[PDB]
């Protein structure tokens, strides 16, 4: 159910906690939300993902998009870029 497949077993009693209450979960899951964003087709071997917004984003990092097969993915945003 949750982001990590956290689902109390059919016999676990913490399910009593959810009795007469809502088990809080978020419909918007990141694993999926990042996928939607398309691969950025940059034209330089190495590009940088400042995180969007500079100081309001994530530490700046340079990605090597040299591997033709795969696409570079910022360890921070998850945004992907291909040459």
């Amino acid at each position: 159910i949750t982001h990590t497949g956290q689902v109390y077993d059919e016999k676990d009693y913490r399910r009593v906690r959810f009795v007469d209450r809502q088990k809080e979960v978020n419909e918007n899951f990141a694993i999926d939300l990042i996928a939607q964003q398309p691969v950025n087709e940059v034209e330089h071997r190495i590009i940088a993902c400042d995180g969007g917004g500079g100081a309001l984003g994530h530490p700046k990092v340079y990605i090597n998009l040299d591997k033709e097969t795969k696409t570079g993915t910022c360890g921070y945003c998850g945004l992907q870029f291909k040459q």
């Binding site: 676990d12 399910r15 009593v16 906690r17 009795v19």
Partner: protein, 339 residues
């Protein structure tokens, strides 16, 4: 199951998830206490407003006590309470037949539906509590009805433990407070002048600990234990003793029961929790039965605690400033009657 990890105190785990429907009760309070102390998961079905069950919150730890809204007439409420419990304990009982609940309901009707569902759920064990010396023919409708139940529930739930406690001795109990509160009454009626109704009280905790131990022991299945006590008593010494610790005059005057059952009928008419009950009266003068039965306390692991030992705490509130400091040693003990 839940492997038991921890050192044994709060914030530890024992692996007993237990619905306890009548926890708000005097006995109940104690049952939740030990279950919570041990670290067991306790689901407390409640009907009274949240204000009244607050006393149960501090007992048990966070996420260890869960309270569910439940109505006896509504079968669905019992259904969801036992959904995730593996132990069900039934303490549903009353002394005054209420307008919308009859002795049958509180003792036999309801406690059946409950265990019935518990089975559907697949709870490992059900503990049903019925009063001691409960013949299907006993005079008090209460006792007889209770007897009726212990039978039925066995068919809804086989091998369901049936502890059968005597009248209980404890702070907030009736057995001890009732007599002590006869002070308001100038004279304290006592059928047969308080004779020939030998009674054996049992401390509430002993009962509670016993009950709890049942939950965590394979030896008890289909067992009908009888928590009794450490010493019997003719009602005379008990009454006087009480008045003794309360330090209030004792004036035993005999009252023909036939007339007294009528007095019980009177208070019984009271809208707000009749203080005495026709069914009570009989019970009070209903002699305690002898001890030849699956033993309870000690057998289940707790050594009974003599009445005199803790009586001081139960009867203290009834004393006057003059006697408040007085202690048990100053007072005298009552006498038992192996009879």
């Amino acid at each position: 199951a839940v492997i038991p990890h921890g050192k044994g105190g709060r914030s530890s785990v024992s692996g007993v998830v237990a619905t306890v429907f009548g926890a708000t009760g005097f006995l109940g309070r104690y049952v939740v206490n030990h279950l919570g102390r041990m670290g067991s998961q306790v689901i407390i079905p409640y009907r009274c407003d949240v204000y009244d069950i607050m006393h149960l919150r501090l007992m048990g730890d966070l996420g260890q006590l869960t309270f569910l809204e439940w109505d006896a007439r509504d079968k669905d409420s019992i259904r969801k309470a036992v959904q995730h419990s593996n132990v069900v304990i039934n303490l549903i009982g009353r002394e005054w037949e209420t307008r919308n609940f009859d002795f049958e309901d509180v003792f036999v009707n309801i406690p059946r539906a409950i265990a019935q569902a518990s089975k559907e759920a697949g709870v490992e064990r059900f503990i049903h509590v019925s009063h001691l010396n409960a013949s299907m023919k006993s005079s008090s409708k209460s006792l007889r009805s209770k007897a009726v139940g212990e039978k039925e529930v066995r068919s809804v739930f086989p091998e369901a433990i049936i502890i059968r406690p005597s009248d209980i001795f404890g702070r907030e109990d009736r057995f001890l407070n009732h007599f002590a509160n006869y002070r308001w009454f100038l004279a304290v009626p006592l059928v047969s002048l308080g004779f020939k109704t030998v009674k054996q009280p049992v401390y509430v905790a002993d009962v509670s600990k016993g009950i709890v131990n049942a939950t965590k022991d394979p030896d008890a299945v289909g067992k009908t234990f009888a928590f009794t006590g450490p010493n019997r008593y003719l009602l005379f010494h008990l009454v006087k003793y009480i008045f003794g610790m309360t330090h209030r005059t004792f004036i035993p005057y005999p009252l023909p029961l036939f007339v007294y059952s009528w007095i019980g009928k009177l208070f019984g008419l009271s809208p707000f929790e009749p203080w005495t009950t026709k069914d009570k009266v009989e019970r009070i003068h209903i002699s305690d039965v002898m001890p030849t039965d699956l033993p309870g306390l000690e057998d289940l692991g707790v050594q009974p605690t003599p009445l005199e030992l803790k009586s001081i705490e139960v009867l203290r509130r009834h004393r006057t400033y003059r006697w408040l400091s007085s202690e048990i040693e100053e007072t005298k003990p009552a006498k038992t009657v192996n009879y």
